Amino acid sequence: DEAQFKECYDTCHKECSDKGNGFTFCEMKCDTDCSVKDVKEKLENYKPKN
C-alpha cells in the first residue's frame, strides 16, 4: 500500500499548515506524524528543599 499514508501525509499537511507553520517543516513533521518512531523519555530531576 502507500495511499492510506499518502492521505494521512496530505491531509495531515492540511491540519499541519493550519498551525501557521511552513510547508517544508510541515512535511518533515507530517512525515513522522502519521508514523511511529523512537524517542526515549526525557529523564529529569530536581532538588526540592527539605
- Write the DSSP assignment of the chain as a string of letters: --HHHHHHHHHHHHHHHTTT--HHHHHHHHHHHTS---------------
Cell numbers describing residue 18: 493550519
CB 16 within 8 A of CB 33: yes
What residues contact residue 45 under an 8 Å CB cut-off, 6+ apart?
none
CB burial string 13-41: b at 16+ within 10 A, e below: beebeeeeeeeeebeebbeeebeeeeeee
What CATH class has 1-50?
Answer: mainly alpha
Which technique? NMR
- Evaluate the CA torsion angle 31, 34, 39, 43 in order and state its sign: positive
For the chain, domain boundaries: 1-50
CB 25 within 8 A of CB 47: no
